[PDB]
Ligand binder design. Structure first.
Ligand code: HEM
Ligand SMILES: N=NC(=O)c1ccncc1
Ligand SMILES: N=NC(=O)c1ccncc1
Ligand SMILES: N=NC(=O)c1ccncc1
Length: 249
């Protein structure tokens, strides 16, 4: 359903150079999970009915950074600003989605296709559109489905983003990694989710909701058994997420 815009040769060269620089920077800083979260929080505010929100650069605005759901993302924005300044031709919107793509790649995840051309929009979306970690499957469908326009398969695959990183008691209040390898992108989120609560690892109520839903559970089982299947569905979902409202949504 996508029709991607034309960007200049100079834009495309910038991106390819920005992609490379982001790889080295994100690997060295150890900030891949935070960058993935930044990219996803940027995108996940899209509402399909009104065509508002989405991956359009607004997360850098103080008003959006102030959203409680975005606690700690100011760190991410600050970390990227020197690099972003090396690529003045790129939109923030593109730059942050590119950072998300690279975050997945440099932790060993799938190569998520990337298309340039998002424009930086002037107005952040209203607060409160991002998912609540204490809620369950109905809520996940409200947010990812009714608002964003993503599928049930997308919800499960994207929840697998928790295969990298950790919660922080000073940010959400939850604490610790979902996996034993929080800088490695693999199917371990699902493996852990299935085996039960292991000391030192985190499961949100929203993660656990996947285990009891009739549609979500078969997907968890598939991804735990088949990492290639996970990688394929993840790459599809991340691309869709990163393109919400862009080039047609
Ligand atoms: C399914 C609904 C989701 C809920 C309820 C949720 C909730 C959370 C919460 C509460 C945290 C901890 C923030 C903190 O205290 O630092 C977090 C972290 C994180 N989330 Fe999600 N999330 C969801 C989906 C996603 C998606 C779709 C992605 C990306 C594809 C994602 C990527 C991440 C990453 C990488 C972290 C780790 C951040 C870090 O290490 O600093 N999450 N998520
Ligand atoms: N959680 N913050 C980070 O990942 C980070 C912040 C500053 N420098 C390196 C990494
Ligand atoms: N950690 N949560 C996220 O990254 C996120 C999940 C859904 N929509 C936007 C952002
Ligand atoms: N679902 N809640 C969140 O994503 C969150 C809430 C507050 N601070 C960081 C993250």
């Amino acid at each position: 359903g996508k029709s991607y815009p034309t960007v200049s040769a100079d834009y495309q060269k910038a991106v390819e150079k920005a992609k490379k620089k982001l790889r080295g920077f994100i690997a060295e800083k150890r900030c891949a999970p935070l960058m993935l979260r930044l990219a996803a929080h940027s995108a996940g505010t899209f509402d399909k009915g009104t065509k508002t929100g989405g991956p359009f650069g607004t997360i850098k605005h103080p008003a959006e950074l102030a959203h409680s759901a975005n606690n700690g993302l100011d760190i991410a924005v600050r970390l990227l600003e020197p690099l972003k300044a090396e690529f003045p031709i790129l939109s923030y919107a593109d730059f942050y989605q590119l950072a998300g793509v690279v975050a997945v790649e440099v932790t060993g995840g799938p190569e998520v296709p990337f298309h340039p051309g998002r424009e930086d929009k002037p107005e952040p979306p209203p607060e409160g559109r991002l998912p609540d970690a204490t809620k369950g499957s109905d809520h996940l469908r409200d947010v990812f489905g009714k608002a964003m326009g993503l599928t049930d398969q997308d919800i499960v695959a994207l929840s697998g983003g928790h295969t990298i990183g950790a919660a922080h008691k000073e940010r959400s209040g939850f604490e610790g990694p979902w996996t034993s390898n929080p800088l490695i992108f693999d199917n371990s989120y699902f493996t852990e989710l299935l085996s039960g609560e292991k000391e030192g690892l985190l499961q949100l109520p929203s993660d656990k909701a996947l285990l009891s839903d009739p549609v979500f559970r078969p997907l968890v089982d598939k991804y735990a058994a088949d990492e290639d299947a996970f990688f394929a569905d993840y790459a599809e979902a991340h691309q869709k997420l990163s393109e919400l409202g862009f080039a047609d949504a």
